[PDB]
């Protein structure tokens, strides 16, 4: 039962073209008429944003289901959520949200069913604009180190509170982004990885003593000869070794440097770069330390193991590595955790479903295998000394379960510790299945399909498909309240496509969708839409596609290549200028997956799919005269420092020019708009802000797909 779609005439605002900007890339001339949009501070760019906001508001005013979606999302997400607890000393800590708090509150308890005490409430600062990203509790549970944002930048300030009375220490550590705070077992301070004072280059590893100014922090590592190398760090569970991981770019590969803290004459004060044991000193493979017994370390690695494995090495004999748990021939070893003193919990991904294995740490022998339902297990935080492991399970139809596995007393049983419940939602009316569909080259692409049980496969249903496809990221079918609104009140079918470029089948899956093979990602996604149409879930023009960042690139490339397949396209903070992405903020870190236009071979890949360079009028191709672009919403925060908004702005300007304003009477009737969030960064928006964005997104989609509300 179709509704009316977009019909009001659109007044696209004037956008100036700089016709003089032309670059030569290895003999190919590329015009960049919206180069000036790369300056966010100019009056012309600010005017562009104001004008696009005005246009978007006029279009969204005609989407009459926005208010209905908004209230239903609010109602469906209005349930208490307890994060996975973790233990320090004899205290437990976790995040909590009563349902509609702007941000999660960090709580402490004396026991798992004892009275929670609020340690830090981000809702009290700036209306909960930002939540906590860095949170770290000392070994004695006396101190809590956490990161606060000051303004809309990605820079974090680390503060420390005493858990006993919630009083702040005077200590303030600036120039941090994503660093952890890694405590020594003496409780005297912590390792962290700041950048030098005034860009994010020349990252350092430092140690901060409690009660001192940042200027007194001990330098452990820097490398002025490699300014773009970035750092992660870790301390072993016994407190004896500090591990520094050095990474280059976005690749899953790192060095491993090991510092023996017990051999230092006067502790870390001895360094008032330090003498690291350079166990791995190349970028050939990934290595994450799982456990050690003295100098004998157990690592997870992808070395000669695209699906990963566990290996063991003695630091005293560092050339000799031995497999502990061999690489599986089919399943990805996603993570491993030492627990209950002498065991390992392994999280495998087997055809995009989790399987947990409990193994003996010393021998690697399998003890128990726990297959998990469709969804995702994550947040295993238990340490080697802990006998009880907690983790979180979520799925499309399961809002959130915190499971407990007591390895001492009842190791085969997952016990429910906390269970979230969606109000006024009957899970049993819906189902999720996994199917495998062929890509253009024959490759099996897993997809998850969620819908009401017993629907007719008559092509009548609106369909939303989501994907990412890059950077070895695994796309799991997790819970979204807005997705349930779509299924229930729009009679929708939801599809999550596990396309190449992700990590789901290991490094070979990732490499089959990066660099020269990035086009495979788009073909995979297109093939999934074709399957949904051929099998009768939906029809072309009732399919909506959505993705963010690298997934926004996915959306923009697919609508350029196959505009006929889609009725709605929503690209959140997409990477749209593939020739220039490497020049802005941290875009240079992505050249591993994408390539870079400064090399001819790589330019040739990039130009073929770069969204702003491939906008073409589909109706000018013979036999395609009835085709237009789908209704398109480009979403971005106005101060996204991860993916700069110029990408979105240049695509928007290019689409509006090619399809609408360069012609006096264009066949393009579907609107091409941007929803620009004012005063927002990349990082985690407050509950109501996020709900407002998602309601706008679904209202626009409902109108674009001509899908009526049910209820």
């Amino acid at each position: 039962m179709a509704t009316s779609g977009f019909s009001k005439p659109l007044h696209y605002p004037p956008v100036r073209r700089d016709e003089t900007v032309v670059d030569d890339y290895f003999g190919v001339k590329v015009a960049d008429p919206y180069r000036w949009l790369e300056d966010p501070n100019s009056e012309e760019t600010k005017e562009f944003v104001d004008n696009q906001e005005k246009l978007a508001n006029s279009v969204l005013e005609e989407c009459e289901l926005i208010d209905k979606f908004k209230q239903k999302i609010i109602d469906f997400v209005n349930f208490p959520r307890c994060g996975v607890p973790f233990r320090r000393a004899n205290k437990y800590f976790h995040f909590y949200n009563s349902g509609l708090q702007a941000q999660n509150v960090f709580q402490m308890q004396d026991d798992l069913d004892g009275k929670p005490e609020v340690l830090y409430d981000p809702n009290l600062r700036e209306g909960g604009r930002s939540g906590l990203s860095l949170y770290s509790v000392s070994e004695d549970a006396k101190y809590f180190a956490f990161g606060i944002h000051s303004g809309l930048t990605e820079w974090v300030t680390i503060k420390i509170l005493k858990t006993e009375d919630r009083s702040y220490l005077p200590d303030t550590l600036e120039w941090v982004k994503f660093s952890p705070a890694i405590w020594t077992h003496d409780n005297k301070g912590f390792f962290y990885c700041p950048y030098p004072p005034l860009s994010a280059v020349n990252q350092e590893a430092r140690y901060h003593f409690l009660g001192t100014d940042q200027s007194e922090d001990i330098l452990l590592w820097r490398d002025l000869e490699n300014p773009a190398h970035h750092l992660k760090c870790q301390i072993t569970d016994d407190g004896k070794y500090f591990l520094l991981y050095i990474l280059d770019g976005c690749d899953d590969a790192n060095k491993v440097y090991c510092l023996d803290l017990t051999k230092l004459p006067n502790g870390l004060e001895s360094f008032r770069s330090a003498p690291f044991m350079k166990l791995i000193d190349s970028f050939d493979a990934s290595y994450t330390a799982i456990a050690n017994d003295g100098s004998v370390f157990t690592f997870q690695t992808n070395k000669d193991a695209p699906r990963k494995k566990l290996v063991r090495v003695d630091l005293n004999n560092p050339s000799v590595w031995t497999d502990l748990v061999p690489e599986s021939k089919k399943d990805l070893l996603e993570s491993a955790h030492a627990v209950n003193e002498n065991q390992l919990i392994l999280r495998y991904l087997s055809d995009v479903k989790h399987v947990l294995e409990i193994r003996d740490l010393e021998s690697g022998a399998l003890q128990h295998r726990l297959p998990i339902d469709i969804g995702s297990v994550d947040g295993i935080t238990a340490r080697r000394r802990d006998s009880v492991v907690f983790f979180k399970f979520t799925s499309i139809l399961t809002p959130g379960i915190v499971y407990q596995c007591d390895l001492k007393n009842d190791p085969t049983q997952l016990k429910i510790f906390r269970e979230s419940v969606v109000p006024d939602f009957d899970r049993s009316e819906f189902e999720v299945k996994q199917v495998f569909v062929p890509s253009k080259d024959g490759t099996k692409i897993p997809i998850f399909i969620a819908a009401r049980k017993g629907i007719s496969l008559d092509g009548s249903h609106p369909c939303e498909m989501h994907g990412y496809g890059g950077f070895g990221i695994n796309m799991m079918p997790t819970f979204s309240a807005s997705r349930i609104v779509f299924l229930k009140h729009l009679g929708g079918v939801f599809c999550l496509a596990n396309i190449r470029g992700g990590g789901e089948y290991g490094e070979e899956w990732h490499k089959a969708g990066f660099r020269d093979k990035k086009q495979n990602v788009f073909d995979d996604f297109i093939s999934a839409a074709e399957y949904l149409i051929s099998s009768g879930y939906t029809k072309a023009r009732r399919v909506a596609i959505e993705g963010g960042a690298n997934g926004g690139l996915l959306v923009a490339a697919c609508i350029n290549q196959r505009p006929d397949l889609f009725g709605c396209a929503e690209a959140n903070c997409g990477v749209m200028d593939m020739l220039r992405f490497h020049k802005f903020t941290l875009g240079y870190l992505w050249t591993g997956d994408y390539g870079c236009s400064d090399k001819e071979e790589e330019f040739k890949w990039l130009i073929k799919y770069s969204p702003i360079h491939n906008v073409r009028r589909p109706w000018e191709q013979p036999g395609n005269e009835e085709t237009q672009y789908p209704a398109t919403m480009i979403l971005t925060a106005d101060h996204d420092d991860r993916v700069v908004p110029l990408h979105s702005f240049k695509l928007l300007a290019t689409m509006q020019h090619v399809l609408c304003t360069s012609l006096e009477d264009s066949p393009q009737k579907n609107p091409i708009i941007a929803r620009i969030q004012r005063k927002a960064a990349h990082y985690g928006r407050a509950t109501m802000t996020q709900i407002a964005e998602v309601a706008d997104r679904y209202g626009f989609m409902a109108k674009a797909l001509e899908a009526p509300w049910i209820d």
Binding site: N97, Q101, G147, P180
Partner: peptide, 18 residues
């Protein structure tokens, strides 16, 4: 504990599974 995937072009301790 600190933010994962930090170098990558990706979006999403989220306040709510919206």
């Amino acid at each position: 504990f600190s933010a994962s995937y930090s170098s990558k072009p990706i979006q999403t301790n989220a306040s709510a599974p919206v």
